[PDB]
């Protein structure tokens, strides 16, 4: 079983950009996540007027 294929091994995390080759590195990876959440939230809100009306 190839260690680089299994995601729980450090070989996968180093050979895929997940692991630094740390905290600032993770912040660099996770930039723009809030924007994606905001966009999906906006689409969900605009995709069901009736359910918001039921909410009110």
């Amino acid at each position: 079983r190839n260690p680089r294929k299994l995601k729980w091994t450090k070989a996968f995390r180093k050979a895929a950009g997940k692991e630094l080759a740390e905290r600032a590195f993770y912040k660099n990876r996770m930039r723009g996540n809030k924007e994606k959440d905001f966009l999906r939230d906006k689409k969900l809100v605009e995709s069901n007027p009736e359910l918001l009306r039921i909410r009110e």
Binding site: E19, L20, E22, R23, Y26, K27, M30
Partner: peptide
């Protein structure tokens, strides 16, 4: 060793 987790952010 683990690094920074999703919860710890």
């Amino acid at each position: 060793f683990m690094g920074t987790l999703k919860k710890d952010l």
